[PDB]
């Protein structure tokens with residue numbers, strides 16, 4: 001995957017978990033021969049789609065990272081709704097894989113357990129990056145070449 | 147800092163007291179960041195927000211939407227919020243402009259008051275939303291074509 | 294609001310309540326100096342969006358009126374889904390306020406109490422028309438003149 | 440009169456008996472209104488309806504969609520109806536054509552049978568849908584450009 | 587006789603064993619109908635399916651999407667399936683091409699195994715989906731411009 005151009009956009013709300021998710025992505029990136037991907041930070045998950053759109057004009061793959069944790073109001077339902085609609089629309093507009101690595105949990109423990117910390121069960125940041133790079137390679141093979 | 151960004155704010159009037167609080171938080175954050183006079187527009191209901199944000203988006207770098215939707219005894223609550231989500235998301239991607247979401251969606255009136263930024267409130271959504279808009283505008287300015 | 298061009302589309306399903314909703318709209322219209330708005334009737338709520346699209350090509354505001362009452366099947370949930378998606382799409386395509394005055398209730402008493410009959414608690418038909426007319430005047434001021 | 444309207448009908452085959460009832464109601468209303476031979480097309484599933492309605496919309500004044508979706512033991516039921524709702528609504532607005540919705544969505548098989556228009560049924564969705572299509576087509580005819 | 591149709595198949599690999607079953611059913615139906623060598627492409631996850639089907643639709647008369655999504659302990663399950671629904675429906679209408687839906691969405695792993703077409707399964711969604719795509723392609727060919 002030494003030829004693919006990777007971009008990473010991650011939200012800052014719940015900073016510790018974000019650092020873990022971002023850490024997993026960079027490791028997979030380096031393993032596959034990409035030492036310096038484009039990394040961009042935003043304040044909230046709702047702001048992810050609009051920044052991915054801009055990143056898509058100059059990259060072969062985009063990875064979105066973040067954490068949304070449920071509260072006491074139905075607001076949780078509407079934050080995740082926007083993210084779903086936004087990223088799906090961007091991918092098909094630009095014909096570019098926009099990998100989904102945004103956690104959506106019921107509690108804080110659940111999110112911590114899926115971020116890739118020392119004693120976590122899983123690492124969504126790594127899974128997402130492997131998904132982006134592989135889909136980019138496939139599209140390269142399918143499309144016009146010589 | 148953000149002295150060069152062009153900000154617009156659209157807020158609904160249904161439940162007027164809370165609207166004033168939300169609007170008050172936004173303006174303070176705006177003044178703190180060096181923007182003394184943003185474009186402010188009022189509407190009658192939440193459903194009317196998206197169509198006014200679309201117009202504001204052709205002359206501004208960031209738009210902030212403010213309002214409160216409180217649940218009743220019918221499934222009507224669910225359909226008001228559905229429209230707002232679909233509308234704002236579509237506007238942002240059509241115009242490539244951050245449309246910050248500061249519309250409260252609560253079970254009770256107490257919950258809404260506690261998230262508006264009154265003297266004894268736990269948080270202030272109007273302030274968070276404005277900080278979200280201004281920062282995303284600055285990022286897009288850096289990523290985009292410059293000299 | 295004597296310069297605004299208003300149009301009203303109302304469904305016939307549950308005829309009595311429709312008449313009330315339509316009655317409230319016309320009164321507010323006359324009060325604001327508009328003596329004869331464009332009035333169009335349809336058979337069902339699903340048919341509203343496609344008629345509002347046509348009305349939007351020569352009016353500054355459109356008001357949609359109707360009643361959907363829940364039954365014994367999940368059908369209720371899908372009629373309201375279509376109406377929400379349709380009206381939202383029309384408003385943004387045409388840059389025109391499409392006021393929502395479609396009742397969505399659990400019982401028949403609930404709908405009667407929100408229609409503007411002699412002993413009703415509120416009148417959605419009047420609220421919706423006030424919403425349309427005001428939004429049209431705002432857009433008029435924001436836009437290009439003179 | 441409706442004798443000038445060009446009608447098209449697309450119906451799925453999943454649960455064949457009920458489909459025949461739904462289709463039978465539509466044709467009767469069609470003949471009553473002076474249209475003896477509408478365009479009838481069959482598909483295998485409800486998900487396949489939207490893409491066939493799009494094609495039919497390029498040379499008809501009205502399209503009627505007929506079918507039955509019955510709930511199972513998984514959340515799958517929720518996702519089949521979601522697609523149908525999204526698809527049909529998008530098609531009607533793209534083509535400015537009434538796409539009448541006559542797709543049943545029930546909890547049990549009894550419920551579906553009771554709404555199809557069989558000898559002892561409480562109502563007939565196939566008939567209601569066709570009356571909805573033909574009337575909306577006539578209205579659009581009157582509103583639009585004529586001489 | 588579907589010997590003239592150009593078929594493409596895109597399948598996710600998450601839960602590999604079930605994927606192989608789903609893929610196995612599709613290819614058998616394919617061979618039965620006289621198509622010995624369809625285009626087969628693998629992806630890592632279900633969210634990646636829509637974007638690959640869009641590319642495949644530029645060169646084929648039908649696309650079949652295959653995969654399994656199993657519910658967990660968080661509301662995440664709800665948002666994975668929402669994306670797939672919106673994506674596939676959009677692609678089909680953009681390209682005027684049948685994109686058959688063969689993506690399982692279950693509560694437990696037993697339920698998924700039971701619907702994949704293994705020795706002792708109750709049904710095979712991979713086979714049903716391919717039959718749906720090839721039939722819809724033939725119908726569209728008949729409706730459209732021919733000599």
Ligand SMILES: O=c1[nH]c(=O)c2c([nH]1)n(C[C@@H](O)[C@H](O)[C@H](O)CO)c(=O)n2CCCCCCOP(=O)(O)O
Pocket residue numbers: 011013043044045046047066067068069070071072073074075076079245246247248274275278
């Ligand atoms: O990544 C996030 N993760 C989050 O968990 C998050 C974010 N972002 N934002 C704000 C952003 O979505 C966005 O910046 C704002 O909406 C501004 O437009 C939130 O308000 N949240 C809080 C989630 C809502 C649920 C908790 C609120 O408490 P309540 O439900 O009891 O009222």
Ligand SMILES: O=c1[nH]c(=O)c2c([nH]1)n(C[C@@H](O)[C@H](O)[C@H](O)CO)c(=O)n2CCCCCCOP(=O)(O)O
Pocket residue numbers: 304305306336337338339340359360361362363364365366367368369372538539540541567568571
């Ligand atoms: O304004 C309405 N209000 C309505 O309440 C309505 C309407 N319209 N239509 C039909 C129309 O939406 C439309 O004309 C048809 O679907 C044709 O496309 C309905 O079938 N309804 C009834 C809604 C179904 C729920 C009540 C029946 O009980 P059930 O749950 O057993 O089906």
Ligand SMILES: O=c1[nH]c(=O)c2c([nH]1)n(C[C@@H](O)[C@H](O)[C@H](O)CO)c(=O)n2CCCCCCOP(=O)(O)O
Pocket residue numbers: 158160190191192193194213214215216217218219220221222223226391392393394420421424
């Ligand atoms: O910002 C809002 N906040 C609101 O709380 C609101 C709004 N708007 N609208 C209506 C407007 O959004 C809109 O202008 C109208 O639909 C007319 O187009 C409402 O009817 N509401 C009332 C809340 C929705 C229903 C809950 C009230 O109790 P009910 O269930 O008995 O109707």
Ligand SMILES: O=c1[nH]c(=O)c2c([nH]1)n(C[C@@H](O)[C@H](O)[C@H](O)CO)c(=O)n2CCCCCCOP(=O)(O)O
Pocket residue numbers: 451452453483484485486487506507508509510511512513514515516519685686687688714715718
């Ligand atoms: O018209 C229909 N009517 C239907 O009732 C139907 C259809 N179609 N399809 C399949 C079609 O939607 C479509 O052909 C396929 O998805 C292939 O794309 C179904 O699976 N069904 C069955 C209803 C889905 C809900 C039950 C799912 O099974 P389970 O929840 O018991 O596991």
Ligand SMILES: O=c1[nH]c(=O)c2c([nH]1)n(C[C@@H](O)[C@H](O)[C@H](O)CO)c(=O)n2CCCCCCOP(=O)(O)O
Pocket residue numbers: 098099100101127128131598599600601630631632633634653654655656657658659660661662663666
């Ligand atoms: O085909 C699949 N089938 C699947 O079942 C699947 C997939 N894919 N992906 C991830 C992919 O959809 C995709 O690669 C990612 O979204 C990255 O873009 C998943 O996370 N899953 C699992 C679904 C939920 C993930 C975690 C399990 O639920 P829990 O967190 O509630 O315990």
Ligand SMILES: [K+]
Pocket residue numbers: 056057058059060094095096
């Ligand atoms: K690209």
Ligand SMILES: [K+]
Pocket residue numbers: 141142143144145
């Ligand atoms: K090639």
Ligand SMILES: [K+]
Pocket residue numbers: 203204205206207241243
């Ligand atoms: K702008």
Ligand SMILES: [K+]
Pocket residue numbers: 288289290291292
């Ligand atoms: K630059």
Ligand SMILES: [K+]
Pocket residue numbers: 349350351352353387388389
């Ligand atoms: K207009």
Ligand SMILES: [K+]
Pocket residue numbers: 434435436437438
């Ligand atoms: K002006």
Ligand SMILES: [K+]
Pocket residue numbers: 496497498499500501534535536
């Ligand atoms: K037509």
Ligand SMILES: [K+]
Pocket residue numbers: 581582583584585
């Ligand atoms: K005319």
Ligand SMILES: [K+]
Pocket residue numbers: 643644645646647681682683
């Ligand atoms: K094609």
Ligand SMILES: [K+]
Pocket residue numbers: 728729730731732
């Ligand atoms: K032909």
